[PDB]
Design a protein around this ligand. Sequence first.
Ligand SMILES: CCCCCCCCCCCCC/C=C/[C@H](O)[C@H](N)CO
Lengths: 50, 297, 245, 245, 245
Amino acid sequence: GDRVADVIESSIGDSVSRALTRALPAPTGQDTQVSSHRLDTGKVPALQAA
Amino acid sequence: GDRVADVIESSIGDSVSRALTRALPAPTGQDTQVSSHRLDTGKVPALQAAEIGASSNASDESMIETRCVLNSHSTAETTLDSFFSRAGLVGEIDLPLEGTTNPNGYANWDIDITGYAQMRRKVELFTYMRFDAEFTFVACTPTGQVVPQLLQYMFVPPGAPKPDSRESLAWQTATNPSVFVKLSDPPAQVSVPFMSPASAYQWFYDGYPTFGEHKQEKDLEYGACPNNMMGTFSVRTVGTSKSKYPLVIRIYMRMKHVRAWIPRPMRNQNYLFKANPNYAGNFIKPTGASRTAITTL
Amino acid sequence: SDRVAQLTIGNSTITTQEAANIIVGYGEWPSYCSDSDATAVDKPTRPDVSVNRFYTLDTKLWEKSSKGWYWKFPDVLTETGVFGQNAQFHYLYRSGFCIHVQCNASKFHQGALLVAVLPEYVIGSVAGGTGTEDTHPPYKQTQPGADGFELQHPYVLDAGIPISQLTVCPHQWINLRTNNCATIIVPYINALPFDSALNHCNFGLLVVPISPLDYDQGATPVIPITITLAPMCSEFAGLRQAVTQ
Amino acid sequence: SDRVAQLTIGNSTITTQEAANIIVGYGEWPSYCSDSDATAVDKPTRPDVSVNRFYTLDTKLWEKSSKGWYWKFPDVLTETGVFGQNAQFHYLYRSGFCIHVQCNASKFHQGALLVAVLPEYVIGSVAGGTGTEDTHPPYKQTQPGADGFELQHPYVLDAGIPISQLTVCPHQWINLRTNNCATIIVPYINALPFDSALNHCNFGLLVVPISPLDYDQGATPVIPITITLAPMCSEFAGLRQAVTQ
Amino acid sequence: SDRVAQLTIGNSTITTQEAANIIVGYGEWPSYCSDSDATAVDKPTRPDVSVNRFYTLDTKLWEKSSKGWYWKFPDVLTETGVFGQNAQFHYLYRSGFCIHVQCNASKFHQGALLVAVLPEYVIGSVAGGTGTEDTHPPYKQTQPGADGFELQHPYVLDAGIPISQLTVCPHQWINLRTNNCATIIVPYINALPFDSALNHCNFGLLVVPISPLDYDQGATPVIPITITLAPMCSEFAGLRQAVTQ
Ligand SMILES: CCCCCCCCCCCCC/C=C/[C@H](O)[C@H](N)CO
């Protein structure tokens, strides 16, 4: 049987496909919520990294 | 009393030594735990900074895929007493019949373990050492023959009168400890306590023992520690007439109950003088062997 | 959070924006002598803020061909300020230290300094080269003062000990690419609760460039190394008339 | 916390200090074949650490006039180490991959690499220019091996597909101003649970410089691009005598 | 967390990656006039997004011998967009402001700009040098418009007030070594709840280089200074036919 730790704790055989995303229903286009002027530092949605 | 805030709240007098580390038992080498492939960002055990001055703490598990190994290798033999409690030559006394060194049948050996590199390199690894001593005296003729000669070993503490002749009055040993053995007997063996005025012997003393100008005549006083001058060893052939046999006496020292402080780099140059770190200036040799090129073995 | 630091003691403050953490010598902070360790019966004096302050003693110029320098403690302060006055008037001595070596360069300079603290750093002579001459280092070399002393053979540290094993002592690296300062806090290291501040040097500080300084022609050629240090928990005992050496 | 990363697998470790996060191909980690998806009846071999390790296969030099290069998987490893030996001895194949492209420069260099993974990247010929000739790419071009192959027309990727839409595939950008490495984790992408590791190439990796490399004269002119990759969850089945191609 | 910032208002967004926090003038955000402070009986118009947006009005070139420039508010916007149209059609005026000065350079450039907001910045003349001539500044100097005006004697700010004490007003420093932008949010500063947007200038913005710009020959010699600003909580009242000046 399995007596060595590297076999007992081994992840070999884990056939589940870890999916970081899950499908969500979207019958219509996304709604647009109210926004106001926002003047703050440190936090910046505009600057991204492609 | 204390009424001002800077005195009431003062930390002056706090004699506790804040120690960031505490000793933990470690009878055996550390076990190796199971590890698996690890693919993550932001966290990185491999990259370290020797810049800080601390040894890198990266483990086997954090670098490569390791198995589970129960390490039962004992660490007992690397302890201070295991490493140091082995008798080794520290001094040699010659008692010739006709000679210029000791033709009087006696010899005074100033106690110092720096006369032989084998012992000196081991003891000099630490700055401060506190230990007991066990001295064994192996005496024989230059041909290795044992002869029926009766000897006296006297311990002469610093300040006690040094014998000046084989029949000197100092040999009455009314206060000094003395050992009377024959060469046919097994080598004499005694235990010597920690006799230094300091709390620990210091092999390196970066200073001078007395005040004043240190001119050329008063220049040998550098590096000499009076707290290590444990005294003189006096040996003589017990008799009024000259001994029939020439004798050479080897003194072996074995530390025990050893405590050590302040490790320092191990010597890598040939020793030249007792109680002196002098080295051959023109003959400075590398610590290890060399090779023709760095890209080949 | 680890690169910026500020050390304040007494009436002096030292700041740094490219620090590399702080090394506590042998994992032990400086502390006053306990009553079970003290041997002198007279009450010691603890001047506190008048002596526990950062002293900037001298500035050494790092060059592409420099061999290294070393300073002796508390020799460097035996003739500096109220600390030196107390060390001269008092026979006994006990203190820790906080050594801050400054060496700042640009992002286009390179080089590495090994800043280490070696207790009881006994300096030996070259023994006349061959080794048949029983020489001793002069007073100006065993007790260099505030000017320090340039090593002749940094490989053996002028004492027959390889510098490759010097890192076993409390040490920090000044690698100009990352950090421009090294901070070492050294407690009192001696076999005695007190000792003479003039005759005995508890430890020696070594600053040896392991990787030679380099830079293309045009950059600032003067790269100074400045030693700043502050005694910690200083005690003095055995007052008498002042003694100069 | 996102710029420094360390990838360890098998007995190999790859570090990076200017990373740009990790892309998981199609949001799916490599995994072993489920018993409801497997079709072969023989028990597959899973050598684990002997094959799941980072292989550094070749180094390409980025130049101001480079067009781009592509590699085929697992062709690049069909002749490398225990993984190649297993792929030769076993008919069936299944594995994921973790591709780490290294391209390091200085703060005065500029340029952008597009590192993308295109499954079933079928290479086409130029059809004799006019298109009246029914040519096929040679064996050395369809299966370039560990040396990769330089694209002739990177705009169409030598396959009639614009590179402007290549970003729809799992991709990362090596823009020398910020990051010097691109990490892409690609699961097994095929219509079959297992396939031949020699005949079929599951996907092709493309490294095409979109913004040309530039630097003033005097800076380091050799900017190498090194591909490092590690199979993940590798399986093999259908053992027989070794087959070289 | 303090160096990167994004200001969005109306339909305009201004970003910055080397910001130096945000200064709120006198610790007070712009707000609408309270009913206990208003004196006009007509209902004011609050166009909101059509006027509360970032206007980029002009670009000034910073030189090694520049003396400094100043702008008058809301003069700079009396002739710009829907805000200018409303200011022309309406007698009364009330608004705050958010002034964002952009001045970007490289890591090898040096210099410091003092960006300050001085309410009721009355410009005086040189009085013919000796001071015996009772001159007044021309219309083009008291109301420079969107082009601003270059200071003649920045030491006295052309008004007999030393610039050394200008920091008592809401101010930020553009030191090219660290930050390339200065953000000042100024509420309505007047002794009246409303005032004419044409005749009265509530405050003047001063951009004076205190440390001269410097750089070795070869670097980019054109270092522009761009002023971007956005009215906040703008109100208007007393509508009539448009008035141009
Ligand atoms: C039969 C009586 C024997 C008495 C043995 C006394 C030995 C005491 C042990 C330590 C002896 C000092 C060893 C040398 C210390 C320093 O390295 C040197 N003094 C250097 O100056």
